Structure formats: structure tokens, C-alpha cells
From a paper:
Rather, it exists as a stable heterotrimer in which the apo-enzyme PolB1 associates with two subunits that we term PolB1-binding protein (PBP) 1 and PBP2. The PBP1 and PBP2 proteins are conserved in the Sulfolobales and other members of the crenarchaeal phylum and so, since the majority of our studies of the replisome have been performed with proteins from Sso, we chose to study the Sso orthologues, the products of the SSO0150 (PBP1) and SSO6202 (PBP2) open reading frames. In conclusion, over 30 years after its first characterization, we reveal that Sulfolobus PolB1 is not a single-subunit enzyme as was previously believed, but rather is a heterotrimeric holoenzyme. We speculate that PBP2 may facilitate polymerase activity via its interactions with the knuckle on the thumb domain of PolB1, conceivably influencing the position of the tip of the thumb domain and modulating the interaction of this domain of PolB1 with the primer–template junction.
Residue numbers in the entry: 11 to 70
The structure:
Amino acid sequence: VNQKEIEIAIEYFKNYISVGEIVATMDLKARGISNPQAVISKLIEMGIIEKGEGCYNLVR
Ligand SMILES: [Gd]
Ligand SMILES: [Gd]
């Protein structure tokens, strides 16, 4: 997973606190992330975001 892509996704979830799986996937691809699934998994691993039911929440 690319480091610039990690920084792009982090900034995205900071501005969008709770976002659905499908909107997040669409919006991350729009900001140049071809594989948002991989970046999202890494952000969960890092404790940046948590996964609910088809929704991602910024841990804070
Ligand atoms: Gd939780
Ligand atoms: Gd959760």
C-alpha cells in the first residue's frame, strides 16, 4: 500500500467522520486510489477508522 494514498484516505475520513462502504470506495477512487479496499484495511489496522455495518467511522 502506497504511503501518499494512506495520507489521502486519512484526510478524507477526517473531513467525512462516518461514511458508507460504497460512498467511501467511490470517493477514494475519485481521489486517485485504484484499490481503496487495501488502503481502508490498513487504516483499520492502524486504528484510524473502525468498521460498523457497511460504514466506516473515524476513531478520534
Ligand atoms: Gd467499536
Ligand atoms: Gd465498528
